[PDB]
Amino acid sequence: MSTEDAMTVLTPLTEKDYEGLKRVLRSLQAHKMAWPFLEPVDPNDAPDYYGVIKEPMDLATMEERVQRRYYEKLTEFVADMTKIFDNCRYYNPSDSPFYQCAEVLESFFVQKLKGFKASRSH
Numbered sequence: 001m002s003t004e005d006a007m008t009v010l011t012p013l014t015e016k017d018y019e020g021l022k023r024v025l026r027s028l029q030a031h032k033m034a035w036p037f038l039e040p041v042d043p044n045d046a047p048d049y050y051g052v053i054k055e056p057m058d059l060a061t062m063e064e065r066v067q068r069r070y071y072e073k074l075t076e077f078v079a080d081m082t083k084i085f086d087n088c089r090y091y092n093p094s095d096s097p098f099y100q101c102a103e104v105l106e107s108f109f110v111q112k113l114k115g116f117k118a119s120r121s122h
Protein backbone atom coordinates (compact mmCIF):
# COMPACT_ATOMS: atom_id res chain seq x y z
CA MET A 1 0.00 0.00 0.00
CA SER A 2 1.36 3.39 -1.04
CA THR A 3 1.32 6.59 1.01
CA GLU A 4 -1.45 8.10 -1.13
CA ASP A 5 -3.44 4.86 -0.87
CA ALA A 6 -3.15 4.85 2.92
CA MET A 7 -4.25 8.49 3.12
CA THR A 8 -7.15 7.92 0.72
CA VAL A 9 -8.55 5.07 2.82
CA LEU A 10 -7.66 6.22 6.34
CA THR A 11 -7.05 9.95 6.72
CA PRO A 12 -10.00 12.17 7.77
CA LEU A 13 -10.77 14.90 5.27
CA THR A 14 -9.68 18.28 6.62
CA GLU A 15 -10.94 21.72 5.64
CA LYS A 16 -7.86 22.14 3.45
CA ASP A 17 -8.74 18.80 1.83
CA TYR A 18 -12.26 20.11 1.21
CA GLU A 19 -10.86 23.17 -0.54
CA GLY A 20 -9.16 20.75 -2.93
CA LEU A 21 -12.26 18.59 -3.39
CA LYS A 22 -14.28 21.73 -4.18
CA ARG A 23 -11.72 22.62 -6.85
CA VAL A 24 -11.86 19.10 -8.33
CA LEU A 25 -15.66 19.13 -8.43
CA ARG A 26 -15.84 22.60 -9.98
CA SER A 27 -13.35 21.55 -12.67
CA LEU A 28 -15.63 18.66 -13.62
CA GLN A 29 -18.70 20.92 -13.65
CA ALA A 30 -16.87 23.29 -16.03
CA HIS A 31 -15.70 20.52 -18.38
CA LYS A 32 -17.05 20.44 -21.94
CA MET A 33 -18.22 16.84 -21.45
CA ALA A 34 -20.05 17.45 -18.15
CA TRP A 35 -23.39 18.50 -19.68
CA PRO A 36 -25.05 15.05 -19.18
CA PHE A 37 -24.22 14.99 -15.47
CA LEU A 38 -24.77 18.46 -14.04
CA GLU A 39 -28.29 17.72 -12.76
CA PRO A 40 -30.18 14.53 -11.90
CA VAL A 41 -31.49 12.42 -14.75
CA ASP A 42 -35.06 13.45 -15.52
CA PRO A 43 -37.52 10.57 -16.03
CA ASN A 44 -38.55 12.23 -19.31
CA ASP A 45 -34.94 11.70 -20.47
CA ALA A 46 -35.39 7.90 -20.12
CA PRO A 47 -38.70 6.69 -18.64
CA ASP A 48 -37.40 3.41 -17.15
CA TYR A 49 -34.25 4.96 -15.64
CA TYR A 50 -35.26 5.06 -11.97
CA GLY A 51 -36.57 1.51 -12.04
CA VAL A 52 -33.19 0.35 -13.35
CA ILE A 53 -30.59 2.57 -11.66
CA LYS A 54 -30.68 1.89 -7.92
CA GLU A 55 -28.26 4.61 -6.73
CA PRO A 56 -28.53 7.63 -9.04
CA MET A 57 -25.94 10.37 -8.72
CA ASP A 58 -25.15 13.70 -10.38
CA LEU A 59 -22.75 16.59 -9.91
CA ALA A 60 -25.33 18.90 -8.31
CA THR A 61 -26.01 16.31 -5.62
CA MET A 62 -22.25 15.98 -5.08
CA GLU A 63 -21.99 19.77 -4.82
CA GLU A 64 -24.59 19.74 -2.05
CA ARG A 65 -22.82 16.90 -0.25
CA VAL A 66 -19.47 18.68 -0.49
CA GLN A 67 -20.90 21.92 0.90
CA ARG A 68 -22.53 20.00 3.79
CA ARG A 69 -19.20 18.22 4.56
CA TYR A 70 -20.91 14.88 3.98
CA TYR A 71 -17.68 13.00 3.23
CA GLU A 72 -15.31 11.91 5.99
CA LYS A 73 -12.90 9.92 3.80
CA LEU A 74 -11.71 10.43 0.24
CA THR A 75 -12.93 6.92 -0.68
CA GLU A 76 -16.52 8.10 -0.08
CA PHE A 77 -16.14 11.11 -2.40
CA VAL A 78 -14.61 8.90 -5.09
CA ALA A 79 -17.40 6.34 -4.67
CA ASP A 80 -20.14 8.94 -5.26
CA MET A 81 -18.32 10.35 -8.29
CA THR A 82 -17.74 6.89 -9.73
CA LYS A 83 -21.48 6.17 -9.42
CA ILE A 84 -22.16 8.93 -11.95
CA PHE A 85 -20.07 7.20 -14.61
CA ASP A 86 -20.91 3.60 -13.67
CA ASN A 87 -24.65 4.32 -13.75
CA CYS A 88 -24.29 5.97 -17.16
CA ARG A 89 -22.37 3.07 -18.69
CA TYR A 90 -24.71 0.55 -17.05
CA TYR A 91 -27.83 2.06 -18.62
CA ASN A 92 -26.63 3.33 -22.00
CA PRO A 93 -25.18 1.80 -25.17
CA SER A 94 -21.54 2.62 -25.78
CA ASP A 95 -22.35 4.88 -28.75
CA SER A 96 -24.68 7.07 -26.70
CA PRO A 97 -23.46 10.66 -26.31
CA PHE A 98 -23.90 10.16 -22.55
CA TYR A 99 -21.63 7.10 -22.56
CA GLN A 100 -18.95 8.88 -24.61
CA CYS A 101 -19.05 11.81 -22.18
CA ALA A 102 -18.76 9.46 -19.21
CA GLU A 103 -15.61 7.94 -20.70
CA VAL A 104 -13.98 11.34 -21.21
CA LEU A 105 -15.15 12.91 -17.97
CA GLU A 106 -14.09 9.92 -15.89
CA SER A 107 -10.57 9.99 -17.36
CA PHE A 108 -10.45 13.71 -16.52
CA PHE A 109 -11.62 12.96 -12.98
CA VAL A 110 -8.90 10.29 -12.62
CA GLN A 111 -6.27 12.85 -13.69
CA LYS A 112 -7.58 15.47 -11.23
CA LEU A 113 -8.02 12.92 -8.43
CA LYS A 114 -4.38 11.86 -8.83
CA GLY A 115 -3.28 15.48 -8.62
CA PHE A 116 -5.39 15.95 -5.50
CA LYS A 117 -3.93 12.87 -3.80
CA ALA A 118 -0.40 14.06 -4.57
CA SER A 119 -1.13 17.55 -3.20
CA ARG A 120 -2.47 15.95 -0.01
CA SER A 121 0.68 13.84 0.47
CA HIS A 122 3.03 16.83 0.22
Ligand SMILES: CN1C[C@H](Nc2cnn(C)c(=O)c2Br)C[C@H](c2ccccc2)C1
Pocket residue numbers: 035036037039040041042045046049087088091092098
Ligand atom coordinates in the same frame (compact mmCIF):
# COMPACT_ATOMS: atom_id res chain seq x y z
C1 LIG B 1 -30.99 16.48 -16.73
N1 LIG B 1 -30.72 16.02 -17.84
C2 LIG B 1 -29.85 14.88 -17.67
C3 LIG B 1 -29.45 14.27 -19.05
N2 LIG B 1 -28.46 13.18 -18.78
C4 LIG B 1 -28.87 11.82 -19.00
C5 LIG B 1 -30.20 11.55 -19.59
N3 LIG B 1 -30.61 10.16 -19.81
N4 LIG B 1 -29.73 9.05 -19.46
C6 LIG B 1 -30.15 7.69 -19.71
C7 LIG B 1 -28.40 9.29 -18.91
O1 LIG B 1 -27.67 8.39 -18.62
C8 LIG B 1 -28.01 10.70 -18.68
BR1 LIG B 1 -26.30 11.04 -17.93
C9 LIG B 1 -28.89 15.25 -19.92
C10 LIG B 1 -29.83 16.36 -20.08
C11 LIG B 1 -29.28 17.39 -21.13
C12 LIG B 1 -28.60 18.53 -20.72
C13 LIG B 1 -28.11 19.43 -21.66
C14 LIG B 1 -28.32 19.20 -23.02
C15 LIG B 1 -28.99 18.06 -23.43
C16 LIG B 1 -29.48 17.16 -22.48
C17 LIG B 1 -30.11 17.01 -18.68
